[PDB]
Amino acid sequence: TRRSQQTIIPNIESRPWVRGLSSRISIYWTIVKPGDVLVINSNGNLIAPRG
Amino acid sequence: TKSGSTYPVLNVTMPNNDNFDKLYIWGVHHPSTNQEQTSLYVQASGRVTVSTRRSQQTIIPNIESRPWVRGLSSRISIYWTIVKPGDVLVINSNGNLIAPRG
Ligand SMILES: *[C@@H]1O[C@H](CO)[C@@H](O)[C@H](O)[C@H]1NC(C)=O
């Protein structure tokens, strides 16, 4: 955003099987104030928000 | 450290079947020179990933010429990980691992 950025790099490791999977997903949150803009920049491993 | 000429990608597992929680104290070695990384851990850059079924910790070692403390320009970063009953400990490392003895 125009006030805060969050750069995340995914990790590739053999994690324990949780619910039958060795891969996970890291959820974050970002708050956009009135007037602020949301800029999502990704080249892979993105769990895009619907709204 | 390296054995002969190869440092394998260690992938061990240690389950917690005990009735109480376990605390594992493990560290990560940070060499002072680029030669110290290879003449001890072979690989160009190590990686320690001590993970559980609830939390993972991926550490990348730093190679910098730090001030001489106790006659050494290299340090070791100590970390921690709590394994609850039923949880499993998975240490995944290809170098720069200061493994816990217990
Ligand atoms: C690591 O070891 C665990 C248990 O021995 C196994 O389930 C897993 O597939 C191994 N991962 C790799 C990358 O060897």
- Which residues make beta-bridge pairs with B14? B89
Contact call for A11 and B90, based on CB within 8 A: no
Single-letter code of the amino acid located at B36: E
- What single-letter amino acid sits at A8? I
- Do B92 and B46 meet the contact criterion of CB atoms below 8 Å apart? no
Cβ-Cβ contacts under 8 Å, B53 against chain A: 16, 18
Method: X-ray
Would you tell me how many other CB atoms lie within 10 Å of the CB of residue B97? 24
Q: How far apart are CA B9 and CA B30, in angstroms?
A: 18
Least Cα distance to B42 among B9, B91, B12 occurs for: B9
- In total, chain B counts a number of residues equal to 102
Task: Say how far apart CA B86 and CA B11 lie, in whole Å.
Answer: 19
- 6-35 in chain A: CB under 8 A from chain B: 11, 13-16, 18, 24
